[PDB]
Design a binder for this molecule. Structure first.
Ligand SMILES: CCCCCCCCCCCCCC
Ligand SMILES: CCCCCCCCCCCCCC
Ligand SMILES: CCCCCCCCCCCCCC
Ligand SMILES: CCCCCCCCCCCCCC
Ligand SMILES: CCCCCCCCCCCCCC
Ligand SMILES: CCCCCCCCCCCCCC
Ligand SMILES: CCCCCCCCCCCCCC
Ligand SMILES: CCCCCCCCCCCCCC
Lengths: 55, 55
């Protein structure tokens, strides 16, 4: 259960977060720019919870 | 002067007007949709002034 939950997160998300996202869904016209909330503080806590599950 | 002014308008504009324009300049992000004012009434008067200059 520890290995299987680490492989789903590597496939879906990765292990960081960027500040600007580019979205191509509907009803939005062509492509839009969207901005995230605290993308640097969240990246620090993603790496803290990776080392805990590897130990 | 009548022929030279008809060839510049055929090259720049054409002889009609559409309702939705797609713009790719700066500072706009990617591509946006822009909407014109009375695009059908103006197309009727573009063709009236074409027949006058051809007669
Ligand atoms: C151990 C509990 C995890 C259950 C896994 C079931 C599959 C999860 C979906 C797989 C991702 C699909 C993305 C297209
Ligand atoms: C955008 C720059 C992010 C910098 C990431 C720094 C992460 C430090 C986390 C320390 C984890 C160590 C656990 C013992
Ligand atoms: C320069 C940006 C680096 C971002 C990742 C930093 C990770 C360093 C911390 C590793 C902790 C390992 C503890 C065993
Ligand atoms: C952007 C991703 C950076 C990942 C760097 C951290 C890797 C963790 C290595 C140390 C793990 C300690 C296991 C005991
Ligand atoms: C008879 C007066 C017309 C003057 C014509 C001078 C050239 C006009 C510009 C040509 C179009 C350039 C588009 C790139
Ligand atoms: C979008 C549909 C536009 C229909 C254009 C109709 C143009 C009629 C103009 C008549 C010109 C005749 C001059 C004698
Ligand atoms: C179906 C849309 C047709 C649009 C153009 C119509 C132009 C017809 C009028 C031509 C006038 C010619 C008078 C000599
Ligand atoms: C969308 C453009 C339609 C143009 C149709 C009208 C062409 C004009 C033909 C009649 C001209 C009369 C000259 C004497």
């Amino acid at each position: 259960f520890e290995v299987a939950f680490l492989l789903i997160q590597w496939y879906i998300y990765g292990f960081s977060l960027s500040a600007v996202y580019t979205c191509k869904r509907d009803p939005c016209p062509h492509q839009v720019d969207c901005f995230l909330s605290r993308p640097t503080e969240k990246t620090i806590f993603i790496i803290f919870m990776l080392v805990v599950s590897l130990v």
